[PDB]
Amino acid sequence: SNLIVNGTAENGMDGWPDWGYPVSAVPEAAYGGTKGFKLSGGKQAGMGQKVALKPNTTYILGAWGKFTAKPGTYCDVIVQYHLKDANNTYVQNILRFTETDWTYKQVVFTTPDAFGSDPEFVLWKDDASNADFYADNITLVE
Numbered sequence: 526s527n528l529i530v531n532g533t534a535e536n537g538m539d540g541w542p543d544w545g546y547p548v549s550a551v552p553e554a555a556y557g558g559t560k561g562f563k564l565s566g567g568k569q570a571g572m573g574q575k576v577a578l579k580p581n582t583t584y585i586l587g588a589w590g591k592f593t594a595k596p597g598t599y600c601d602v603i604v605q606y607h608l609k610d611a612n613n614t615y616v617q618n619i620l621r622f623t624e625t626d627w628t629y630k631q632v633v634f635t636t637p638d639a640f641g642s643d644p645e646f647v648l649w650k651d652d653a654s655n656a657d658f659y660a661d662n663i664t665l666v667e
């Protein structure tokens with residue numbers, strides 16, 4: 526059971542709030558199925574959704590990703606939340622992609638005993654070079 530809605534782009538951009546960035550669900554970006562997510566070159570771009578994480582629970586976050594040509598910087602896949610501690614610590618669980626062939630990355634993390642902010646998944650492309658980024662099969666599972 527994937528906590529991310531439509532992590533495969535098989536339902537287009539459905540389940541993903543429009544943040545106004547150049548993110549499309551298109552055949553050229555597919556790792557599998559009929560579509561993948563394409564984050565346009567030339568601009569920073571991201572999308573995300575709130576994720577219903579449980580406390581003291583272990584999760585695996587994974588995704589396939591590639592740039593179409595060598596980028597200036599990177600694109601991150603992140604699950605993030607604040608702790609409910611005195612310092613109000615911000616936790617980012619991050620996969621950082623810079624590669625130009627399809628590359629699978631994953632991170633295993635265990636959630637704290639309480640959240641200080643609503644957990645979110647975020648895909649964020651810092652890079653604004655000419656290369657497009659393709660993301661597909663984005664997965665967050667207990």
Ligand SMILES: [Ca+2]
Nearest residue numbers: 533557558560
């Ligand atoms: Ca797909």
